[PDB]
Amino acid sequence: VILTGALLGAAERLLNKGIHPTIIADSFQSAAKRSVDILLEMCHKVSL
Amino acid sequence: VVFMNASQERTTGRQAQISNITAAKAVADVIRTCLGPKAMLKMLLDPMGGLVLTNDGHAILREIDVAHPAAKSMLELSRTQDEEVGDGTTTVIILAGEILAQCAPYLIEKNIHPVIIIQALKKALTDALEVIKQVSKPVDVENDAAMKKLIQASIGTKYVIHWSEKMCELALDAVKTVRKDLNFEIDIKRYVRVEKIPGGDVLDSRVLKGVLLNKDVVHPKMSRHIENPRVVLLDCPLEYKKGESQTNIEIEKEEDWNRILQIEEEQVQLMCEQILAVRPTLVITEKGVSDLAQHYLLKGGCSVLRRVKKSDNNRIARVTGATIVNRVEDLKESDVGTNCGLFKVEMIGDEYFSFLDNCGLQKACTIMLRGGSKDILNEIDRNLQDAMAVARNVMLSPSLSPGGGATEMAVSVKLAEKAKQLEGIQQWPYQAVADAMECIPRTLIQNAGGDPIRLLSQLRAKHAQGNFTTGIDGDKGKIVDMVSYGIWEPEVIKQQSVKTAIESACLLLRVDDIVSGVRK
Amino acid sequence: AKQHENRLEDKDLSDLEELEDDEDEDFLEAYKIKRLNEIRKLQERSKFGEVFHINKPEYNKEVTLASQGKKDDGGVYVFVHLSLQSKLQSRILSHLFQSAACKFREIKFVEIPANRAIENYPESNCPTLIVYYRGEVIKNMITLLELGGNNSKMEDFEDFMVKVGAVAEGDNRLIMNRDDEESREERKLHY
Amino acid sequence: QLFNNSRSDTLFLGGEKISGDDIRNQNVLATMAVANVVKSSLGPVGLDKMLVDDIGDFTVTNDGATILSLLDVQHPAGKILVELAQQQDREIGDGTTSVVIIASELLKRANELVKNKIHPTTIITGFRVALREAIRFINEVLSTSVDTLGKETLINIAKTSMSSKIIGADSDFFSNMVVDALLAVKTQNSKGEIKYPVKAVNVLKAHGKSATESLLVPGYALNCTVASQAMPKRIAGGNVKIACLDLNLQKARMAMGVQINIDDPEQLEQIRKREAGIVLERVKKIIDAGAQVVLTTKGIDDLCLKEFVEAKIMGVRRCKKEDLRRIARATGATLVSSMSNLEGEETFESSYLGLCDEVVQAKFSDDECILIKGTSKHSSSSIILRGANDYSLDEMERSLHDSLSVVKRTLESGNVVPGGGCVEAALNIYLDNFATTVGSREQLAIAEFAAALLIIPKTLAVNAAKDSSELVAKLRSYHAASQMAKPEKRRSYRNYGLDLIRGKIVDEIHAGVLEPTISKVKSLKSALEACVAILRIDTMITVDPE
Amino acid sequence: EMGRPFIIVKDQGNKKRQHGLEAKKSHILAARSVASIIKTSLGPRGLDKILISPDGEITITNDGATILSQMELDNEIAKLLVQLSKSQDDEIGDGTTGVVVLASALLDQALELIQKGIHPIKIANGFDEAAKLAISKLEETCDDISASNDELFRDFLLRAAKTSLGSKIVSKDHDRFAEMAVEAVINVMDKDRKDVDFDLIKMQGRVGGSISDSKLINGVILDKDFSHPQMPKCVLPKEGSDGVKLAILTCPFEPPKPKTKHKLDISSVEEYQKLQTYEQDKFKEMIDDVKKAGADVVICQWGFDDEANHLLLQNDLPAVRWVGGQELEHIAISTNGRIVPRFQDLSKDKLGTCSRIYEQEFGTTKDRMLIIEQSKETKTVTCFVRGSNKMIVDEAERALHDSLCVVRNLVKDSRVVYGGGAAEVTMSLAVSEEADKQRGIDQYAFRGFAQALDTIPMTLAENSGLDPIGTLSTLKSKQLKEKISNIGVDCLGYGSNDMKELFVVDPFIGKKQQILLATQLCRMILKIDNVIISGK
Ligand SMILES: Nc1ncnc2c1ncn2[C@@H]1O[C@H](COP(=O)(O)OP(=O)(O)O)[C@@H](O)[C@H]1O
Ligand SMILES: Nc1ncnc2c1ncn2[C@@H]1O[C@H](COP(=O)(O)OP(=O)(O)O)[C@@H](O)[C@H]1O
Ligand SMILES: Nc1ncnc2c1ncn2[C@@H]1O[C@H](COP(=O)(O)OP(=O)(O)O)[C@@H](O)[C@H]1O
Ligand SMILES: [Mg+2]
Ligand SMILES: [Mg+2]
Ligand SMILES: [Mg+2]
């Protein structure tokens, strides 16, 4: 509930900068999809 | 954001105690003139509309709803004194008020703690019971002539002192009837019956050992005068008892409906035949009676009376010795009452009255009071309750003490001698107990119309000589000894007064905060 | 309750002397000193008494500013008259100003031509009566059809002065309260 | 406090919103507002109070257990102290007045630590290390239960529970009463573990002579009236049999949904007879067993009363379930819910009946009570309290009921400690030296925790209307030397407290006041767990009702 | 509470409070609510707005001060912005709309820094150091125009005149309003080109006509006709004379009476006839005094009666009535005349001089408005503005007033800067450059002010309909590539981000005043913690 409000705060100033909302939306989905791949490299496996 | 639905504001500190002690003084002021032989009367207007003319303390307090909660502890003392003894209710209230009134200027003035006062009252109560035991003495309990003047002591305040010669014989025969051998006097007021008959004359009365019923016979053929009656008590109705199972009958044949009503007649026939197995002459039942059952009992002469109360059946049982049996099959000759006589129905236009008289030591009686109005019948009836209440304690314990302010003055003189001998921090409230016993003698004197400052001043010097039986007369106000006149009460009344007065003061002195708004 | 108040309230300094024999000296003389002080205040406030015929420059000088008075809020009512010699009601209202000026000396009575009052004023709206008090206009009165028109009398004008708060209701100078001596003489005889 | 805050500025909540240190201050005033009524009731010098229900009815109460339960508070932060008073009454049964004062002062004294930018997580950690250090110090300073040749302990334990009551002056008489009562109603369970069931003794609301002349019953007293007046009231002779039944003895209908239907009207009277006969066959076999006294949970119809009056049997209706288990447990009988056995036949055996020496019905101020004394198998006890009225006896009933719980704990756990704020003052000297050892920010938390514990001995002097600093300074001086006692008994300057009736510091062992250590343990944890619940709240969200 | 009524301040339950973070969000969002009103108004592609007064009258304005002045508000934060726009309007008269969006830009960027936990004083001190640093840089880069001659100095006023007229209506005829605005100052100016008096030129609008009918006239506007219009309307001068010999009098034509109340008593018929002789001889002596003085037109303050109409008509002497004292202050300075108090002090040296007097109708029945014109340069210019609507001519007044105020700023020496978004971006990149080495704790404070200055170019990008990111990216890259700092956002579409080419100029004193009032108000709003407001 805090990261959602933070990204909305990022989208708040970006709406004034003449960018479409759909372009802002797709940017987070591509950025979030890349964020999963970064953590998959960082996370370490454990035993049973 | 109140934080409290029940009195978020508070009245704490000393102001709550001023409201408490002043309220305890106000309940005593409305009954200050209700002491002594020259005491006045009061009238109360209940919301239901039933007026009552009272001077006893218990009847005054119970019919007065009080909004002050601290005062209500004083209202219940006469209730406690009533159920315990039934005499001396007014002295408990004024004595508790004087203890609270005398103990008032110590937290304000001396700032002495309440718990130190609680210790002071217990040692004073311990010494109060000690000197009352020294002042009291025993007397003979079986002397009927001696019992008359003791019953006359409590009667002297009430209106019926003018008929004290009749009231003493009226109460002495009644209390001796219910008395039995076995706390050595286990008889109870519940067995004693008192029926209030408006009309007549109070001088004409007698103690009849029986149970006075307030109804007529059910059938006119029955004889109202029986020489050798035979009482049989029953709980089953003579009517047909309806089953609680809700039984329904499938009638197919034609003779079934006629046979059912014939079985109804056959059941009442067989039921009445079992009543006649022991051939009684008087039957009593606490339930209804069918008209079908009245005819079959005419041949046997079994007089029936119906809708009798449950308590009256028990009182009929103890007088005649009959056993209450529900079913009609278990009637034996021992179940039938015996040693009964003088069954007669006196005709009075208001209501029909039937008398009973005897020839398992428990017994009972019915005092038929005659008067002029229903309200004064309650007055004389309450005097009968006070007439036997003073007689129980002399029979329970043989101990006996004087009264009329003398026994209270003896407590103050003995406490005052040792109050200076104590020489401690608790001696200040210890002196308040000695000064608190002076209200009773004072009250008596004030009501009598004398000057209490000089009458009590010489009374201090009189008791200093070493005598205890010197009191104050209520009519003229002498310092004559009560041995000549004969003012004597039991010891239990004064013991319960000082105990209830001290125990009530301990309850009310330890209150500092008042709250409301709970709505439990 | 009013019977005790009518002894002092309903009697002036000249009428209060009648109760010298009946009422107490201290009760009467205490109120006479009070009423005497009120009479002295009216004399000090009597700075006027005749019609102030002003010019347009003085219109501020004598009207608005004057209505402030001491500025103790010592306000002063200033009745202005936009006169016009051609109209009938104007000369009638001018006569009322001269009569009222001799009586009410504390109230300032002002007169000026209507042509010199407002830029190109409508002549049909003349005469015009304005009442200033502490710089504020209390009443902008229109031609005297409200006050009877051509049949306007002195009694109607004095009644208007009471409505605007210029004169008290129970003032002894008003013709409504100033009963004639013959009227009071008949009342005492028939009493 | 100053003014009301803005109502949902760009938040869109239907209710109220508040945040910051304002609500934290309101919780302090809320805990102090409900604690002020508990302040004056602490210690023997405290005075009682009365709560009016706006219907004339009132009740006198000293302990804060039922006072706060009756006071309907709407602020939820105060409800935790209300439930804390009810919680402490269930487990320990004593000290409900102390946890409210201790929990309120821990929040009040910690309020200064909030505006110092000390986080509550660090404050409670400093409180918790002070707690477990205090519990170990309490486990070191506790004393054994022998102390001499004789017992000389249980009489002194009752005085602590009996103090601050209306009958505290009569505690010398009631001290022998409570110890003789609980030693009679002991039991055996778990292969050697002794238990003491609280409330098993019967507290009767009698009126009469005084609280000093209250006679201790050597046996159980049943509070119920006799059915009929023609029955025998007193039953003498040894080996009086007690029958405890619970089945329905009055005449009842058939099964819950059946309908009686018959064609032949000849047997219509016979089915009526056997329904009246089948209930009397049960009464017939009880007379064959010879039970002098029979007790029933349900009613008793008049069809059964005639047989008891004839055979001189004492039948009593309107008994309750919880009482008859104690009658059967004391008199040696067994609870009979119905008369049957493993076989198909129906009968009654004599082994189901109890035994007692004497049964007498007594009446005192419109209170009929059946006095059952002399139980052969196991003893029992009951206390007949006597006073002014019923509302004064409710304080005595709670006074006795709390006394049983305190005497229960000193027998279950022999470890005790002295009263008068001794351990509350001893922990301050122990924690001050420990506060300097830990170093960092928890010093102020441990220090202010110790300062809050001193409120118990301070309140004894404030309510006494005496000088408090002199008694606290003298109590501080003796406890200050206890840590520096220099062992080699000559370990003096310990186990001392306040004496309020005289205003001096004397030995509490000789004065005769003690309290079990387990009450101190559970009170400290329950007070701190309540303090943790209030400190961790930041913002309130009050939703109005729909 | 403890049960008692716990009250401290009078009207406890009415007023409220607000603190913590929620008090700040009420402040910044209140500025954004006002900034959205001003953001769609700023720039040449802006749009007007209608302000309905309570009395039913409306005003079509696209100026931030007049919008905020006639706006009924409740929040105190906007009421300080109402006074900030009024502060810019009174002294400079340019940038009202800017000082609102710029102050909101500092407030919007301060919201992100409050989330990080920076104290407000460090935020306020950062903008104070950044504002003076930006002013110190912009004072060095701007060039002086005093070296040029008067012919080119007139062109610099035309550069700023076209800048101020545009963005307002009156942007059609704006080429002539620029020449008319510059021509007004050529007449009214000091020989040293310094400290010109602005009070000499008053505003006067007329409801009627069209914008093309407006022209320049050097004289006074009176809303009245001549007395008794039988004479010709347009009076001409004599054949040989210095002028019309204007006369002004603050004395009404009447017999001399005392200022105090008087009582002239006439106790005889002979004295009553002398009063008739005294009545007539005063009017005869009065008209002979002005006759010998040579005056043609007479101006009277306190009016006169109808007797002087025929005496003035026969001698060919026009006159007027009810001329207010404020207009006589304007008549004496225009015609260079001295107002005589009375006729005894009447002399030919005190009379004014002007070219001609005439009157026209402007339509059917509206009113006869007097016109005066001069034959040479004088110390008074009265703009004669016409309009098809009352809101058009009302907006044209305050629009032309701001135009004269912008030229008034250029009268001060060496204060010129090229605007068009260039002044904002050129002050922004240097603040971010200073932060790279002056990092400290206030590194983000400089970045907030650097991003807040760039919002005005982005505001122009929204109104013009261009991409903001591409615009600021090109301007920022161009400023880093070349140190020439007169390139800005051109929204009117003439091509060329360069700008001196596009003849636009702003006052240097006006531009530095933008960040001063913006920073000075932001320092005040950030200090507020407790917000106590009472109910109406
Ligand atoms: N004629 C009398 N002379 C002296 N004392 C009396 C007389 N009559 C009554 N008293 C006293 O007044 C008291 C009144 O007792 P009673 O009326 O029975 O109850 P209460 O004391 O509550 O009124 C008695 O205890 C008695 O000592
Ligand atoms: N006689 C006494 N002398 C000194 N302190 C006492 C005495 N009696 C009780 N206290 C103190 O009072 C405190 C609480 O008493 P408690 O009996 O719990 O009161 P309550 O019964 O009202 O809950 C105990 O911690 C104890 O130290
Ligand atoms: N014709 C124009 N060409 C380019 N820019 C202009 C033009 N007119 C105005 N501007 C710019 O628009 C911005 C806002 O001006 P504006 O809001 O109309 O003035 P004010 O704020 O005084 O009302 C100024 O910074 C100015 O540089
Ligand atoms: Mg009596
Ligand atoms: Mg306790
Ligand atoms: Mg502009």
Side-chain angles (χ1 to χ4, degrees), chain D residues 231-514:
Chain D
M231 291 162 60
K233 309 302 186 68
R234 179 142 177 277
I235 301 299
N239 302 24
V240 172
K241 311 191 193 304
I242 291 282
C244 301
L245 308 179
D246 299 321
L247 80 183
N248 187 15
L249 259 167
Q250 56 260 39
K251 189 176 179 181
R253 67 186 294 279
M254 220 73 249
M256 64 195 173
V258 307
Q259 293 182 348
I260 309 305
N261 199 324
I262 192 173
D263 187 15
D264 188 9
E266 298 293 349
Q267 285 77 247
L268 184 62
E269 191 176 359
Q270 296 292 336
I271 60 178
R272 186 181 287 277
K273 288 279 279 291
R274 198 73 176 276
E275 287 180 356
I278 194 174
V279 73
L280 299 170
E281 285 177 0
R282 301 185 175 81
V283 179
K284 183 170 175 292
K285 58 173 71 61
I286 297 295
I287 291 157
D288 301 329
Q292 282 75 358
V293 174
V294 65
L295 304 174
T296 299
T297 310
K298 316 306 186 67
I300 299 293
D301 203 70
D302 295 2
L303 296 167
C304 298
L305 292 174
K306 68 192 184 66
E307 298 292 350
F308 305 136
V309 169
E310 191 175 3
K312 303 183 177 179
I313 311 309
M314 186 173 289
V316 181
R317 59 160 75 83
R318 301 287 82 189
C319 299
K320 59 184 178 295
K321 179 54 61 172
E322 295 182 358
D323 201 319
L324 289 166
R325 274 191 288 274
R326 293 196 295 277
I327 299 297
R329 184 62 171 77
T331 64
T334 190
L335 196 69
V336 173
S337 60
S338 59
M339 47 179 70
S340 61
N341 52 5
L342 302 174
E343 297 292 349
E345 298 181 359
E346 189 176 1
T347 190
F348 185 84
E349 197 178 1
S350 300
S351 59
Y352 294 86
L353 305 175
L355 290 173
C356 65
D357 301 332
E358 178 166 13
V359 177
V360 174
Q361 189 178 351
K363 188 175 179 180
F364 287 103
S365 307
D366 197 353
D367 185 11
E368 298 181 0
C369 302
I370 292 156
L371 284 297
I372 292 157
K373 56 181 81 70
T375 56
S376 181
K377 198 181 181 179
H378 285 282
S379 51
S380 58
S381 60
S382 286
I383 293 158
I384 292 158
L385 300 175
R386 307 180 87 80
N389 66 330
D390 298 324
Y391 303 117
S392 68
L393 294 158
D394 299 337
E395 175 54 28
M396 294 176 63
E397 186 172 7
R398 288 185 291 276
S399 298
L400 266 286
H401 183 272
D402 297 324
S403 300
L404 302 188
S405 303
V406 172
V407 177
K408 176 169 175 60
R409 291 285 180 282
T410 194
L411 274 82
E412 291 288 357
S413 179
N415 299 328
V416 304
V417 277
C422 173
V423 302
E424 285 77 3
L427 290 170
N428 183 18
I429 308 305
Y430 182 80
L431 290 167
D432 289 323
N433 298 331
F434 184 79
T436 56
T437 302
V438 75
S440 65
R441 294 173 99 83
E442 297 181 6
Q443 187 178 359
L444 299 173
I446 294 157
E448 296 292 349
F449 183 81
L453 293 168
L454 270 291
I455 195 170
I456 293 292
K458 289 227 188 71
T459 306
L460 301 172
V462 170
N463 297 334
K466 303 294 183 181
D467 192 0
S468 65
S469 65
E470 294 180 359
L471 276 292
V472 170
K474 281 176 279 183
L475 190 68
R476 184 177 285 275
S477 180
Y478 279 71
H479 283 81
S482 184
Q483 192 67 40
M484 301 183 291
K486 185 170 138 57
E488 64 189 353
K489 302 295 189 298
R490 65 182 305 276
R491 192 162 165 71
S492 185
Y493 313 135
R494 204 174 75 271
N495 307 335
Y496 298 159
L498 295 93
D499 193 351
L500 310 180
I501 55 167
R502 299 201 306 280
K504 297 181 176 64
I505 305 302
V506 306
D507 191 4
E508 306 301 337
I509 304 301
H510 296 289
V513 297
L514 299 169

Side-chain angles (χ1 to χ4, degrees), chain B residues 1 3-6 8 10 14 17 20 69-70 72-73 76-77 79-80 83-84 113-116 118-119 122 125 129 182-183 188 190-191 235 240-250 252-253 256 259-260 263 267 270 286 310 314 317-318 323-327 329-330 332 492 496 499-500 503-504 506-507 509-520, chain D residues 26 30 33-34 36-37 40 44-54 56 58 60 70-75 164-166 168-170 207-213 226 229-231 233-234 251-254 259-263 265-266 268-269 271-273 275-276 280 301-303 306-307 309-310 363-366 368 386-390 392 463-465 501:
Chain B
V1 199
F3 310 108
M4 279 194 180
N5 292 349
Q8 177 53 73
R10 293 174 62 192
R14 301 280 73 76
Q17 198 169 116
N20 287 20
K72 198 179 291 303
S73 61
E76 296 291 352
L77 307 179
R79 199 273 299 174
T80 300
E83 297 181 358
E84 185 63 19
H113 205 261
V115 306
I116 303 300
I118 296 289
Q119 296 293 349
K122 295 288 187 296
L125 179 57
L129 300 170
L182 188 68
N183 307 307
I188 311 169
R190 177 257 296 286
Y191 292 95
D235 299 333
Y240 174 75
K241 184 63 173 178
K242 192 185 287 186
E244 64 187 344
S245 60
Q246 303 296 342
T247 302
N248 55 356
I249 310 304
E250 297 182 358
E252 191 175 3
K253 298 185 285 295
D256 301 334
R259 279 291 304 171
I260 289 157
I263 289 155
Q267 188 171 6
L270 184 62
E286 68 194 346
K310 299 179 80 68
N314 300 324
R318 299 297 204 177
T323 300
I324 293 160
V325 193
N326 199 339
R327 288 185 67 78
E329 291 179 2
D330 306 330
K332 281 86 78 175
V492 176
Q496 291 289 340
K499 287 177 193 182
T500 303
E503 292 288 357
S504 67
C506 290
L507 183 65
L509 285 164
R510 303 187 67 166
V511 176
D512 57 331
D513 184 71
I514 301 298
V515 280
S516 63
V518 173
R519 299 184 175 180
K520 188 177 176 182
Chain D
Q26 287 182 350
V34 72
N36 292 330
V37 307
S40 55
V45 290
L47 273 61
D48 305 0
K49 304 184 180 65
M50 52 177 67
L51 276 63
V52 180
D53 305 359
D54 304 14
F58 76 107
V60 177
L70 287 167
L71 293 167
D72 186 12
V73 307
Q74 290 286 315
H75 200 265
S164 77
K165 313 303 185 197
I166 193 173
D170 303 354
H207 317 80
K209 302 252 185 296
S210 168
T212 56
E213 302 186 355
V226 71
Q229 273 62 266
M231 291 162 60
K233 309 302 186 68
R234 179 142 177 277
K251 189 176 179 181
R253 67 186 294 279
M254 220 73 249
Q259 293 182 348
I260 309 305
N261 199 324
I262 192 173
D263 187 15
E266 298 293 349
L268 184 62
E269 191 176 359
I271 60 178
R272 186 181 287 277
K273 288 279 279 291
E275 287 180 356
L280 299 170
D301 203 70
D302 295 2
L303 296 167
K306 68 192 184 66
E307 298 292 350
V309 169
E310 191 175 3
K363 188 175 179 180
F364 287 103
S365 307
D366 197 353
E368 298 181 0
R386 307 180 87 80
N389 66 330
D390 298 324
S392 68
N463 297 334
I501 55 167

Side-chain angles (χ1 to χ4, degrees), chain E residues 62-63 93-97 163-168 402 406:
Chain E
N62 48 302
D63 181 55
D94 185 13
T96 57
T97 67
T163 307
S164 181
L165 266 294
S167 91
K168 257 83 173 56
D402 299 330
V406 167

Side-chain angles (χ1 to χ4, degrees), chain C residues 160-175:
Chain C
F160 168 72
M161 296 175 67
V162 175
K163 293 182 176 179
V164 307
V167 179
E169 297 181 0
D171 202 334
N172 298 324
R173 291 172 290 183
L174 297 166
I175 196 175

Side-chain angles (χ1 to χ4, degrees), chain E residues 213-229:
Chain E
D213 301 329
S214 299
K215 59 184 181 180
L216 274 164
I217 42 165
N218 303 324
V220 192
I221 300 297
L222 313 180
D223 307 331
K224 54 182 66 52
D225 69 326
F226 301 123
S227 73
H228 190 247

